[model samples]
Target: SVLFISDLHLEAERPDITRAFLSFLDERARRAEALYILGDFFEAWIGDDGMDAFQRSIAQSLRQVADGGTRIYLMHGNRDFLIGKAFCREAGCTLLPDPSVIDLYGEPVLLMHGDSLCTRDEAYMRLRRWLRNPLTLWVLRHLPLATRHKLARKLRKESRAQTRMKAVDIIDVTPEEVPRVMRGHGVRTLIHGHTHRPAEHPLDIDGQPARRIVLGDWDRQGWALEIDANGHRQAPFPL
Candidate 1:
């Protein structure tokens, strides 16, 4: 089976989520042929150079799973965009492009962290545009580890404040944007996580039956999308 998950937001503050993820790595992901983490795999990742004990533990767990023969692909989420090649190497996983297309069970499957589709969040989009630039990331990577960690905390706090003032729909995937990306990618199936709204959406895209699968965050329940020869199903596990 192929497994998909996201929005874990793993951190020292959320030890329960981390424990659930470790359990997933041991009991569930070990049996899968492939595992795709769409995004927000961590609460915050300032940089690979600044990885702490918690992050290292997560990396080791992932490495164990990878070494057991499960293919793992990770995409950067809004909070963990600073994850780099060095960290990926330690984790024994490949870093996937945010909006990547791959052959999944003979069908074209589109994968993303799902934040880019939230076009209504103009302020966040502006910040995303600036942060995603190569030059900006280069500058950020050159900063002292302590400074980067401080900035990460400040940014996270500001983000939470802004989110509290915004409407729910504004932070979610834009209706038109979903079809636009699927059509452009020539894929009818899309899997993403970020909005924290977990549901399967059926769409009529260019006269075809298309489906969008949203993975849940690991705050309340541990969830995953499992795909196999039988088809796909979203299931939740107790945290």
Candidate 2:
């Protein structure tokens, strides 16, 4: 079976989510053939310099689970996009690109971290472009450990404040942009996680049935999509 999840927002504030996530590695993750963590696996994943105890422990667990046989893959979410090769290597997982096309259950599906598709959020989109540039990333990657931590804290504060100011609609995926993105990727089905809204959205794409699967965030609850070898997929909640 293939698995997908997003918006874990894991940090000190959400200890319960971390506990449940670790249990996932120990149980369901170990048995799955391939696991795809769509995005936002952390509340804040600063640069890979001098990871704290919590980060190290989780990374260690993931590595062990992957080594045991499950094929683990990851994509960068807005918050955790700074996650670098060090973490993936430590976790023994392959890091997939933002918009990845893969053959799943005899059908090609477009997979993403889901942030790039939010075309309506022009401000955020522009910011994303700036931050994701090679030169900016290079500078950030070279920052001192202490400086990176401080910057991360500042960004987190700013993000929380911005979220408070923006309307809920602004945070959601735009309807028109969905078809545009699908057309660019040339896929009918898109799976991603970001806005923390979990549901199956059906759309008409060039007279074909298209869909977007929005994965939920682990705020007061947990969410995940489970797919078996037969192309059947479903998102289970709260457990």
Candidate 3:
């Protein structure tokens, strides 16, 4: 069986979140063949060089899991695009590209952070394209820690403000864009996390059946998606 989680948005001040996450690693993730964290693992990740004691502690927990033999894969989220090889090495996990396809029990399944699908957020999308550019990322990563932190905070603040003014659907995945990427990937299943809306939607892509799974974010409760020999199932656990 494999495990998948996303949008934990972990932060130092939220000890409760850490407790639940560590418990999850011990109780559930430890038993899986692999743990795929789709994205948004941290609330804000300025850069790998900025990792402090708290981040190191989290890395240690992941290391223990890796030592126990379950492979962990982490993808970059909008809030944590600067996670580099340094942190991945420390955490003993592999860094997966934003849009990846992996064989899941024999079927091809595409994984993403889910932000790009919100095409209706034109302004944010424009900013995202530029911010995620390779050259831009390199420059951002090379900046001083203080500069990075300020930029992270400023971007997050702007995001919050823009989201508040946008319509609900506009801030969400565009209906047509979903199948567009699914078709492009030539996969029937796409799993992602970003909007924090957790649900499985069944649809038809070109004449075939398809589905999209949105991993839930952590806050009032925790959410997880599990894929076993039986099938795929998603459930929430109270924090």
* TM-score per model over all chains: 0.98, 0.94, 0.97
Estimate, for each residue in 13-96, the C-alpha lDDT of model 3 and write its tens digit.
888888899999999999999999988999989888899889889999999999999999999988887889999999999999
Ten contiguous residues with the weakest lDDT in model 2: 230-239
Reference-based lDDT, residue 236, model 2: 54
Clashing pairs in 3: none
Report the lDDT tens digits of candidate 1 across residue range 1-239.
Answer: 99999999999988889889988888889999999999899999888988999899899999999999999999999999999999999998999998999899889999999999999999999999999999999999999988998988899899999999999899999999999999999999999999999999999998999999999999899999999877989988988
With candidate 3 superimposed using the best TM-score fit, by how many Å does residue 137's alpha carbon deviate from the native?
Answer: 1.4
TM-score of 3: 0.97
Rank order (by TM-score, best first): 1, 3, 2
Can you give the lDDT of residue 238 in candidate 2? 52
Pairs of residues clashing in candidate 1: none
Provide the lDDT at 4 for model 1. 98
By TM-score, the best candidate is 1
User: What lDDT would each prediction earn against the true structure?
Assistant: 0.94, 0.83, 0.91
Model 2 residue 183 lDDT?
84
